[PDB]
């Protein structure tokens, strides 16, 4: 794990929040990715909106040669989704964390995404 990048895509009423861990090709294993909303210092898999440990066989979505992806999908954005989000990842064995930058969704009955 070197670093985590954050992105977003949308179509119709649906918004996808995307976290991407970049890593060496031989260091694809042994970390969990997760996305947290409005935590103050306790972002973990247990406090996350979504977590994922990816198995690296062919035919599985999110599996890259030097990257791994987590996608959290909001089918319809409501006021519940307004707030500040962060992508994180954690390796079990070595203890290391990586954090992404903070970004925000603001419900306005439309929405803006900022900080990406």
Q: How many domains does the chain have?
A: 1
Task: Tell me phi and psi for residue 50, to 5 degrees.
Answer: -160, 140
Alpha carbons 86 and 83: distance in angstroms, whole number: 10
Alpha carbons 82 and 63: distance in angstroms, whole number: 29
Contacts of residue 13, defined as CB under 8 A and 6 or more positions apart, other chains included, come to 75, 76, 77
**Structural domain harbouring 19:** 1-116
**111: enclosing H helix or E strand:** strand 111-114
Of 54, 48, 51, residue with least CA distance to 67: 54
Strands (E) in 12-101, as ranges, are: 14-22, 31-37, 50-52, 67-74, 83-91, 97-99
Experimental method: X-ray
Q: Which residue has the tokens 């996305």?
A: 35
Kindly list the distances between the CA atom of residue 16 and the CA atoms of 73, 76, 91, 96, in Å, as whole numbers in the listed order: 4, 10, 24, 26
């Amino acid at each position: 794990m070197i670093n985590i990048t954050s992105s977003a895509s949308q179509e119709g009423t649906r918004l996808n929040l995307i976290c991407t861990v970049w890593h060496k090709k031989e260091e694809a294993e042994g970390f969990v990715m997760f996305l947290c909303k409005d935590r103050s210092g306790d972002c973990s898999p247990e406090t996350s909106l979504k977590q994922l440990r990816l198995k690296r066989d062919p035919g599985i979505d999110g599996v890259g040669e030097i990257s791994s992806q987590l996608m959290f999908t909001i089918s319809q954005v409501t006021p519940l989704h307004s707030g500040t989000y962060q992508c994180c990842a954690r390796s079990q064995k070595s203890g290391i964390r990586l954090q992404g930058h903070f970004f925000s969704i603001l419900f306005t009955g439309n929405y803006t995404v900022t900080g990406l």
